[PDB]
């Protein structure tokens, strides 16, 4: 069955974590 809005929002919230980790990695690599 098709997804729900809560599932999409939870996916966005979960993806918020690799965004922060990637920002940290980019700042570390620039250094």
3 lies in the site for ligand CLA, by CB under 6 A: no
Closest approach of another protein to the CB of residue 21, in Å: 4
The pair phi, psi for residue 2, each rounded to 5°, is: -60, 160
Q: CA-CA distance, 26 to 24, in Å (whole number)?
A: 5
Closest approach of another protein to the CB of residue 1, in Å: 7
Closest approach of ligand CLA to the CB of residue 8, in Å: 6
Q: CA-CA distance, 7 to 29, in Å (whole number)?
A: 33
Binding site for ligand CLA (CB under 6 A): 8, 11-12, 15
């Amino acid at each position: 069955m098709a997804l729900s809005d809560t599932q999409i929002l939870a996916a966005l919230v979960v993806a918020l974590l690799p965004a922060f980790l990637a920002f940290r990695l980019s700042t570390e690599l620039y250094k």
